[PDB]
């Protein structure tokens, strides 16, 4: 054993030992309890970033911990390979997206290997290989013939200068983000998952996920947005019927979740596209401009609530079916066509959005709910105005004194008796649009035939292979310009036909990859029956916050679809969720000769407090998430090159709890490294003073007080570490506990025969308690202390007798 810790001299050997023993290559072995620990697989962008290293170290700790506790652990790794960055890199570097992607996979796989993650690499998948995406094409065709996938016209944002479609997040003030050209609203046929057929199941089955964070479930519930409400029809006044036809000339239909407040409605609001808006706008240019602006907006969903609410009166009136009030119709930008009837009633006194709308336009506010003796102020919103539980009806004639549910049913009865309304359930959930006008994604397995229509590709002819000899040029998406790809024959009649050229939303690949890991070479289905039955559901899922709502929702949807096809037996894919925190770092800049700032990467400055560009000073600025926005990313490879993998893993687990933001710290990295030196020196000094002995075990009566206190600390530490790994998932406090154990060890005389046995017991436990965090140095130190295989000695046991104190 060398005297000094040299991670370059031990980390390759340790990795080769694990690979040779194949501890991470797992099969469907019913002789051992399974554990499926899954970390969100990476986009092969070119090289790991610090977020990757944090995510997969957290996954590795949990995996290695459960391995030491006797579990058959599958910890798989793969590549979420489709998407825009490969296209972007192709347009910049004149290379093919596939070539760029596979070179990135090869480099990043090496980096992951160098960190010593206990990964079953025989289960590696790459979603851009046809051996993978053929199976989501297969699922598509099966759902398409059932109508769960369907074709329908939808509206997209066309950038005529870049010749491509943009999401609302890539549209700024109505113009494309990169071009600055005004976008054009185009209606084109696209494909959709009928996810709304599964809304009730996707909402109710959340109750099964006892170990999910409550706010993640809450966000799933809000996104599905089930409401139980009331359809209410407002007769159109005789003076307001010009230009209307059909049912729109008889009544205005709305949906409301507060029909108990129908006596307090003071006006109604319709979408820009509602026929009442069209008819009223016919001879009013101000309404035509307002309708045109609503149609031209590109507000993303995540920003819909923060959009300023605006309306225009129409001079058209409708009649409240309960009290006969004539109410004016307004056109408003927050009423969306397609959401229910595209029309709502407004009760400003008891709905805060209506309150602020009415207060802006000085529309009337009518109180119809009372909560105790609380004063109602028509000029100031109070939280109790919206209270649905403790309120009682007022100013409602026949309905006064009723609570929410009784007034709900009485209004239901009144309306139904008049033919003017009925109860109704609605969902905010929209169907899932999967068509993308992009090249580097999974082809959609549809052929368009003028005689046969939209025809699914037969299972025998899957995959529809995406050609990889393609370099996108930025003058439109390549597939629509490649007749050698889209020109084909109809699989139903043999006549001339054309393949669909749109590709699939890349969320599809990540909605089932965790099943594919169970049998990644299986050629007869998405996943083999034996492997799905054994592995079941993911026991632990570790990932980030970005896109989590949709990804979780989509993966739960796909599970229910795959279960209904007889491919899996679980209703839910993920039993536990750990969302890791972002990694943040300081930023640095120098001012421009053009009134702006040039952002400097931390690897290109030296800190004297103050900074200098590698030699004039730079400005040290604020701390924020590492990104290319302000060029403050720290390269994990330089951290590995300078200190080794264990230092990297230890710093990330020590610096903050996994869900907390982790602040980059040079001194913290160095502190992590010095601790590894300490751990190395402690074992080396123990073994230089007499060589290893048998670890103390059994009855400790007759041990000195100081050695009993060390064994108390020892088995108290083991209990704490076990609860931190297995229950709290708080690895930083577990590292500190082992540090406190080593401190007590340092202050304890262990030179006696019983002392050496306790010391051996202390060090044998500590190296095993830390093996999930820093396995290379711990594997190396364990073999100097004990001849058994560490993974067969297993997780350290708590000696409860070491914790019982001597009575008085
Ligand atoms: Mg349960
Ligand atoms: Zn045909």
Author numbering: 1 to 608, 616 to 621, 624 to 817
Q: What did the paper state?
A:
Mechanistically similar to other adenylate-forming enzymes, the class Ia aminoacyl-tRNA synthetase (aaRS) LeuRS charges tRNALeu isoacceptors, which are essential substrates for protein translation.
As has been previously recognized, the active site of NgLeuRS is large (approximately 758 Å3 in the apo form), which is necessary for association of the various substrates. In the apo state, the synthetic site of NgLeuRS is fully open allowing the entry of all substrates. Comparison of the NgLeuRS apo structure to that of the NgLeuRS·ATP·leucinol ternary complex shows that the CP1 hairpin (residues 147–194) together with a structurally associated α-helix (residues 84–93) rotates 31° toward the active site pushing the editing domain (residues 225–427) 29° away from the same region.
